[PDB]
Amino acid sequence: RPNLVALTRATTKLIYSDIVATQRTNQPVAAFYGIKYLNGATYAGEAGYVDREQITELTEESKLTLNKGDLFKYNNIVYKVLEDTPFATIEESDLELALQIAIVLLKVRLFSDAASTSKFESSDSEIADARFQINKWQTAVKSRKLKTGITVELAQDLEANGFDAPNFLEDLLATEMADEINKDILQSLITVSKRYKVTGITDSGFIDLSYASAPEAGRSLYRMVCEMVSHIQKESTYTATFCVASARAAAILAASGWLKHKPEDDKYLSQNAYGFLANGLPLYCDTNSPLDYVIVGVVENIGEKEIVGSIFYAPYTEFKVVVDPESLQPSIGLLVRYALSANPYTVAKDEKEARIIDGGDMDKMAGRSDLSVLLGVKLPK
Amino acid sequence: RPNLVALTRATTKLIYSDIVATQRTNQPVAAFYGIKYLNGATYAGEAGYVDREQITELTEESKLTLNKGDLFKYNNIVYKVLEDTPFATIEESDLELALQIAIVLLKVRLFSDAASTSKFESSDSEIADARFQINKWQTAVKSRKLKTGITVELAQDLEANGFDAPNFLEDLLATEMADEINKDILQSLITVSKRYKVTGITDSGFIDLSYASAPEAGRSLYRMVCEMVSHIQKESTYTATFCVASARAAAILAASGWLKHKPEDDKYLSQNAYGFLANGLPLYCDTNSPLDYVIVGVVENIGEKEIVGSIFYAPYTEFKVVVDPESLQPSIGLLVRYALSANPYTVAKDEKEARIIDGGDMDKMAGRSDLSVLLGVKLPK
Amino acid sequence: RPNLVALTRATTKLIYSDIVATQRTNQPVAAFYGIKYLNGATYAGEAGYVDREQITELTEESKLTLNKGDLFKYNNIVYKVLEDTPFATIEESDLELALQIAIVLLKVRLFSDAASTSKFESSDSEIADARFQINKWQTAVKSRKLKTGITVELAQDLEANGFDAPNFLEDLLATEMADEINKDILQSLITVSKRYKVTGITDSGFIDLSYASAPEAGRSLYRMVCEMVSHIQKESTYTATFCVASARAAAILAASGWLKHKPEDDKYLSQNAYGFLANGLPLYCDTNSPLDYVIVGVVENIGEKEIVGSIFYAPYTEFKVVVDPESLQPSIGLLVRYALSANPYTVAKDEKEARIIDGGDMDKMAGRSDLSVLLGVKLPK
Amino acid sequence: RPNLVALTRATTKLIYSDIVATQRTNQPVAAFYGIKYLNGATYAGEAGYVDREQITELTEESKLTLNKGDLFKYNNIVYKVLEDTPFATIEESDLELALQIAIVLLKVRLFSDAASTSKFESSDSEIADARFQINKWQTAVKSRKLKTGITVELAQDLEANGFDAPNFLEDLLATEMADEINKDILQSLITVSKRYKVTGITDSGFIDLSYASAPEAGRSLYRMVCEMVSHIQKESTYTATFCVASARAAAILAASGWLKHKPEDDKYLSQNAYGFLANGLPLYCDTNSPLDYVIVGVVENIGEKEIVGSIFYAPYTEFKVVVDPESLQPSIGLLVRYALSANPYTVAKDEKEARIIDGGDMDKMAGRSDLSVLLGVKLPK
Amino acid sequence: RPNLVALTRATTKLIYSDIVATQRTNQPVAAFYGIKYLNGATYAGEAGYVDREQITELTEESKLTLNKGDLFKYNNIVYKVLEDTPFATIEESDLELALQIAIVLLKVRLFSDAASTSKFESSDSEIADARFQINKWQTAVKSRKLKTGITVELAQDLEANGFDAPNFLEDLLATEMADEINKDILQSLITVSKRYKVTGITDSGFIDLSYASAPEAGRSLYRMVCEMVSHIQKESTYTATFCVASARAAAILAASGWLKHKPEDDKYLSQNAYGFLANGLPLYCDTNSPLDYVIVGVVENIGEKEIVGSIFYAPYTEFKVVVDPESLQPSIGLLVRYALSANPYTVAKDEKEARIIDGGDMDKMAGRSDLSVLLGVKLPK
């Protein structure tokens, strides 16, 4: 239906299609797709996995009983021993650091399992496993309808303003619809995003830049936000692609040199974006959420497929506007339906749990994104 | 009259046509239009409103009588309860903040009323109402005449300078006309803009960067200006789109790194702009008002119609420049007429009050923009 | 004279042609034109002025006798009274500031005299007078001449360098001529520029960044310069369009982050600019004058005519090169002539005084630009 | 195999192909080439060497026995003596500095052995030998393989997603493969890079920005990273061309104004870069290595050949994807083979050592890049 | 010889051809040309000079005996007296400053000798002499040669690498030649550059930012460097055009915020630039000299001729490559020759001194550039 296609074009141009992954449906449900994995470094191969288990866990009671040429693993990373008794000269008790140090000082070597053709073919060894699994799920399409284009005495007013009024009123209707869609998206993103936490939540409490705390410059938030990106980079094979925040949270707070105020509007910045940060990521401004929060996350793709995201959006078209001639008031209404969801497998161990949940159930998906993190923020007022 | 079209273009190119919404008339009055809503969050339907009233106002006393699956609303925002007794572990006494905490801690979830198509069609439920409505009003077209192109002995001098004088003089005269028009607009904007206020005005009194206060860098003003932009975003679905300030207020004061000196003018900047801010918005400069103030506000549109602004401008053409040869002086007279107004519905409960007021009456519209805010500023004088 | 025109093109490109206004002559004297007004706001009509006279001067003893609906004026700006006894609640003793407060708090309202067409036509009301007058004056075309293209054995040297020498030497001679001309321009500009003075000269003495004062970063000068631009905006209907400073004054001194070294050489920047500032304005540098000063001011045009400026330049062609074999030496003489002047009306009440003065008499025009100011600067030699 | 050519070209776009030198093979081994010299100043000729030997080693007891016209050399730099007894007036006891002082004070002069041909031909002298030698080596092509494109019930899922599933799965597998390859490269770069060290390592211990040290802004890291670039400039004939770091180490840590977030994805930056430093060089973000390190180094070419690099990559093509219908699971296997190596010459004096080592042996090449340096960083964890 | 043409054009792209003036020869010596002179303000005319002498030297004893209309001179600048007894109200005892002040306060006026046609023709007056004097000198073309193309066993390696080897080798050898040429130039620039000196050398000693002084940020060096530009501007009719410094002296030091690492290079920078400074002129880097210095200076041209430079370069061709296949060694030689020089007249009063010296004699030209200065720097090593 070309008229719905046109209304769709004129309404979705106004929504945050870029802070969610976009897919589409033609079904009562949307068949959504996504990619996930629970651990990250080196290989995912089983042959190699077994070797890791068959070499050593690197217990601190064994770290120095190793000698030149030996292998060991730690947190699944295989390393070779350079010269004898690695760590003999390292006072550090924490293996995470003792190892960090040992690598730097060339006591141990990050081990590469690239190997000859013969290794594989002769051994008839296992082969590397998947880094990620690809999921699919079906989430019902939900809708909302507006009945707002009031006509009657208004029809006369609209006729008086008839130059623009026919389409104008439909466009105004679409505008409010887009706004409600964006709110719905943001609520889901807020809900699904993992809470960002460091040492008992962002340096042992939600970041607090309140009057009684640290009304500095806004710099300490910018630092925390930058760290949120590192978290994503640490935990997933991506880099944050977008950020959303309220004005008080960052879209204004970061104005103190930590925010790039849309110097250009067609370069790495969408039309609905507020701007981007001093460290990039198009920044979107929420403006509605009472939290004055910040979200950092990833929306990505495989070829043309927007399969990577915390939230996925899939409109169901075959954005319809109608007039209902009730009484003397033949007003204009607008119906929009879409599926909105998170990858349900991030709350499931396997398909026998995924099959009894719904990616659109934001009570269950709460805090389970892993492609996004949420910063709670306390501000002056 | 094509010659007036040419004079119009050669005069309006010189005024801040974008710091007001621009409409046009052909009537003795301009039929102005604009959009307003009296409150945000979620859907605007009666069904919603009823469900909200039918669940709870979240009286603090009742916050722990809530359990998993329950709904509640606060400040008209609907939330669902995640697990039992939300807020049981939140020591915060200010319910607004306790709620923000509950959301980030996933004790409660921002709730969407989206539902299946069947829900609505089967139940014959109500439908979301309009949030914003379009208002109309009529404001008289006022005018200003100049008798400034003096010729006589002056004609002789103009003849001596006859190389340029004919058109030169008309453009010069047009320039003075444009100046007065622009200034007239700015005075209206100053008057209509809401006074910016936080905790008893800009942090309990207007910003004071005087000698006895904080002759810092001007950073503290930028901060407040940025908050003004936030305020607009908080209270309306717009970001600031422009700002005007005097030199001492910001057009010079902010030139300590928070003002961009028109690096370029063929992109992202109107030709009469002084430059733009570090907060992106086109910075204009008045230079006349004794106030040395800063105004932040928004102009916008639905498709082609500039329906959003604190002040609306509507010139009436059918920029008349004629010779008035009284005595021995074939001098040039210039007449421009236009309507200029604020949306009168911002000072009315309904149309029965709007119909007895005038959007052009700045004694009534004063401080009632909602699409702009004014910052009073005390300087090192 | 095409050969001289070619030299003109190749020589005037080497001077700061845009820090002064450019006009041209074809006469032994140059007829210069320019625009001035002596006090900026609202209408300049007699009706306006009379109504202002008929309402009040807003004296301290009368500001409280005003009530709702009354008008008053101050510093020629008309304001309307909002509600009774404006200023009743304002303790501020400086009436001008009290007024600024009253505007912000909506005790008074910036008032526009714009009115219906009928008001004007019915009463046969007066009309706005001109704000600015257009002046004309003439000065002699003055000249300089060189005997510097030395030839003899030099001819032999030039013959040795004969692949380039004919043109090379004329271009070189033209260059040194251009250099002195540029310097001459600066002397006139320096002289005419008004001394920037605030509270007994730029915060009660010329800015001093010497060792015994403020050997800081140069920031305090950058701030003062930006304020010089404000001064221009205050006193004239223009923003600064250029700035020139010595190395020690600002071309180097402000190069601590508030000065840019021509990052781009073809956009909004002349080929002769040293660079531009962080507060805009192409930046020029004199390098000769003992003053070590900074000048801020404006060149502006109506169509093609550079009518606005502190100094006006008007070259006279019909760059003459003459080859004269004194004895054994066919040296090259170079002659360049132009008018250069300040608008004499800045030192005159009317034509009777203008007719007995000379815009080229810099002993009278000194400090009388109003379209430019100079900052004296004490430096940490 | 055109399909593999396409898969390779369309997949290697995802690895840090430019932070290594890229060469290619068609053999079971890759023939790699690279360039090295042991010292940088003046000519590398025997005649020069002898003249230097014949004048002095600049013993501090002899530094002042020199007089005007004499030559001396120090650290292979030849200097001529200006005036008598150079250093007579230099109190500095450290000859390295005393020389720097003498040079700046014009007591000595940097000397060139350039001369007329007559000098050379008459003398029948020697000529400069090569500074840099070109070394070649062969390193076996190694591989990694996936058997992860799972099909069965998954085939049904892929059919359900049949719209684009065939290529999707291959593209995804190729992506995961690219990721593993890139990891292998990074481990090799980490290993080969020399440990940056000043006065016992980065000012007597690895940079430490831990909470017990200097949790500043990240400024101090930027400084050390920048110093690593100076090291590259000092010890080679190239400037750094790239930088790679973990997120915590710098992609995020330096995003306090010392790092740019890829504001442009096609200007002095590859598509795989996270950004570029405030001081340039595309910055790649590792994200996997536990080291939290920073690497600065070079890749450079002569004509089309990327002859210079610490690590060299040489893929062996004739990204192979096949399906193996074992059981009911006809999964997609993917194999990629390439040589990866360091120039073995950096750990050898000559061919009799080079012939018993392998550029691909990272247990020997560790710390021996000379075209890269790594900074260990202790972070505020 | 087309092969010399191709090799030279394709290789000199690698030397700092723009930090010297480029000229060319075809002779065994190069005929270099250049401009120097004694001062920089107003005219160079003898009659005007005499007038200066005929008015006053402005000794303080006479500064108060001057009255309205009088002229006086100081440091060859003529100034006019405004009103009587100039300086009567100036407490300053140092005439240099008293004059600076008097000019600012309009007690005196910079005097322009632009004059009427009558002045000149009536008196049949003299005419201005040259501000500049033009020199020519002849400097021998010296050669530098390489026997760097080692082939034998290497020839077989080159055959193995026959894909690239023929030209690869010549290009590489040519690259090393470019390096030596560049280094040769830099040594000459270092030597000729005048020591930047202020109050006994850059604030009474070479700038010292060492740990024993001021290990700040590097800001103080940037300030000194910017002053070096000032020096060029004060001493000559040019601004600095380029800057070269060691890696530690500026390429890295200024990374702290006063250096941009080539964010753009298809505009305003040479391909061999490191980047450019915050008060930028392309920043180049030597990487060899132990001095860790900074050079600031200027090259300039009249049409196509680079008549200005501290050092001039003039190559002589008829990059020549030869082969000497003794035994099994068909090795490649590379020969390049050029003249390199400073304007010898900077160390001569007249031709009887210039004719017995050589601009290529860096023992005599040491410290006598005047078109460049060098700063010694003590770094925090």
CSV table of N, CA, C and O in Angstrom, one decimal, chain B residues 344-376:
chain,number,residue,atom,x,y,z
B,344,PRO,N,-1.3,33.8,21.6
B,344,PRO,CA,-2.1,34.3,22.7
B,344,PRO,C,-2.7,33.2,23.5
B,344,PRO,O,-3.2,33.4,24.6
B,345,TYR,N,-2.6,31.9,23.1
B,345,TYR,CA,-3.2,30.9,23.8
B,345,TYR,C,-2.2,30.5,25.0
B,345,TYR,O,-2.7,29.9,25.9
B,346,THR,N,-1.0,31.1,25.0
B,346,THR,CA,-0.1,30.8,26.1
B,346,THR,C,-0.6,31.6,27.3
B,346,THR,O,0.0,31.4,28.4
B,347,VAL,N,-1.5,32.5,27.2
B,347,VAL,CA,-2.0,33.3,28.2
B,347,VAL,C,-3.5,33.2,28.4
B,347,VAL,O,-4.2,34.0,28.9
B,348,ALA,N,-4.0,32.0,27.9
B,348,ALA,CA,-5.5,31.8,27.9
B,348,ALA,C,-5.8,30.4,28.4
B,348,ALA,O,-5.1,29.5,28.1
B,349,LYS,N,-6.9,30.3,29.0
B,349,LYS,CA,-7.3,28.9,29.4
B,349,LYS,C,-8.0,28.2,28.2
B,349,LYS,O,-7.9,27.0,28.0
B,350,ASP,N,-8.7,29.0,27.4
B,350,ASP,CA,-9.4,28.6,26.2
B,350,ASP,C,-9.7,29.7,25.2
B,350,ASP,O,-9.2,30.8,25.4
B,351,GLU,N,-10.3,29.3,24.2
B,351,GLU,CA,-10.6,30.2,23.1
B,351,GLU,C,-11.6,31.4,23.5
B,351,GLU,O,-11.6,32.4,22.7
B,352,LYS,N,-12.2,31.3,24.6
B,352,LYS,CA,-13.1,32.4,25.0
B,352,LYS,C,-12.4,33.5,25.7
B,352,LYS,O,-12.9,34.6,26.0
B,353,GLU,N,-11.1,33.2,25.9
B,353,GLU,CA,-10.2,34.2,26.5
B,353,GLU,C,-9.3,34.7,25.3
B,353,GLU,O,-9.1,35.8,25.1
B,354,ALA,N,-8.9,33.7,24.5
B,354,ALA,CA,-8.0,34.0,23.4
B,354,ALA,C,-8.7,35.0,22.4
B,354,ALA,O,-8.1,35.9,21.9
B,355,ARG,N,-10.0,34.8,22.3
B,355,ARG,CA,-10.7,35.7,21.4
B,355,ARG,C,-10.9,37.1,21.8
B,355,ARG,O,-11.5,37.9,21.1
B,356,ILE,N,-10.5,37.4,23.1
B,356,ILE,CA,-10.6,38.8,23.5
B,356,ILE,C,-9.3,39.4,23.8
B,356,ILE,O,-9.2,40.4,24.5
B,357,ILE,N,-8.2,38.8,23.4
B,357,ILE,CA,-6.9,39.3,23.5
B,357,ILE,C,-6.2,39.3,22.2
B,357,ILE,O,-6.7,39.0,21.2
B,358,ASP,N,-4.9,39.8,22.2
B,358,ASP,CA,-4.2,40.0,20.9
B,358,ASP,C,-2.8,39.5,21.1
B,358,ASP,O,-2.1,39.9,22.0
B,359,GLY,N,-2.4,38.5,20.3
B,359,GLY,CA,-1.0,38.0,20.3
B,359,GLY,C,0.0,39.1,20.1
B,359,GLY,O,1.2,38.9,20.4
B,360,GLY,N,-0.4,40.2,19.5
B,360,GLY,CA,0.5,41.4,19.3
B,360,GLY,C,0.5,42.3,20.5
B,360,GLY,O,1.2,43.3,20.4
B,361,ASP,N,-0.2,42.0,21.5
B,361,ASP,CA,-0.2,42.8,22.7
B,361,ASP,C,0.9,42.4,23.7
B,361,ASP,O,0.7,41.4,24.5
B,362,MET,N,2.0,43.0,23.6
B,362,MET,CA,3.1,42.6,24.4
B,362,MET,C,3.0,42.9,25.8
B,362,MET,O,3.9,42.6,26.6
B,363,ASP,N,1.9,43.5,26.3
B,363,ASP,CA,1.8,43.8,27.7
B,363,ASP,C,1.2,42.6,28.4
B,363,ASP,O,1.1,42.5,29.6
B,364,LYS,N,0.7,41.7,27.6
B,364,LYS,CA,0.0,40.5,28.1
B,364,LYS,C,0.8,39.3,27.8
B,364,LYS,O,0.8,38.4,28.6
B,365,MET,N,1.5,39.3,26.7
B,365,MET,CA,2.3,38.1,26.3
B,365,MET,C,3.6,38.1,27.0
B,365,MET,O,4.4,37.2,26.8
B,366,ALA,N,3.9,39.1,27.8
B,366,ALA,CA,5.2,39.2,28.4
B,366,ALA,C,5.5,38.0,29.3
B,366,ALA,O,4.7,37.7,30.2
B,367,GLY,N,6.6,37.4,29.1
B,367,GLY,CA,7.1,36.3,29.9
B,367,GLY,C,6.4,35.0,29.6
B,367,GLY,O,6.6,34.0,30.3
B,368,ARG,N,5.5,34.9,28.6
B,368,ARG,CA,4.7,33.7,28.3
B,368,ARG,C,5.0,33.0,27.0
B,368,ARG,O,4.2,32.3,26.5
B,369,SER,N,6.3,33.0,26.5
B,369,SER,CA,6.7,32.3,25.4
B,369,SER,C,6.6,30.8,25.4
B,369,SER,O,6.2,30.1,24.4
B,370,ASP,N,7.3,30.2,26.4
B,370,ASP,CA,7.5,28.7,26.5
B,370,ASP,C,8.4,28.1,25.4
B,370,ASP,O,8.8,26.9,25.5
B,371,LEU,N,8.8,28.9,24.4
B,371,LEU,CA,9.6,28.4,23.3
B,371,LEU,C,10.9,29.2,23.4
B,371,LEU,O,11.7,29.3,22.4
B,372,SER,N,11.1,29.9,24.5
B,372,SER,CA,12.3,30.7,24.7
B,372,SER,C,12.4,31.1,26.2
B,372,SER,O,11.3,31.3,26.9
B,373,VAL,N,13.6,31.3,26.6
B,373,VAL,CA,14.0,31.9,27.9
B,373,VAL,C,15.0,33.0,27.9
B,373,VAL,O,15.9,33.0,27.1
B,374,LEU,N,14.8,33.9,28.8
B,374,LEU,CA,15.7,35.1,29.0
B,374,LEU,C,16.6,35.0,30.2
B,374,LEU,O,16.1,34.9,31.3
B,375,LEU,N,17.9,35.2,30.0
B,375,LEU,CA,18.8,35.3,31.1
B,375,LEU,C,19.2,36.7,31.4
B,375,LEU,O,19.8,37.4,30.5
B,376,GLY,N,18.9,37.2,32.6
B,376,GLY,CA,19.4,38.5,33.0
B,376,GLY,C,20.8,38.3,33.4
B,376,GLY,O,21.2,37.3,33.9
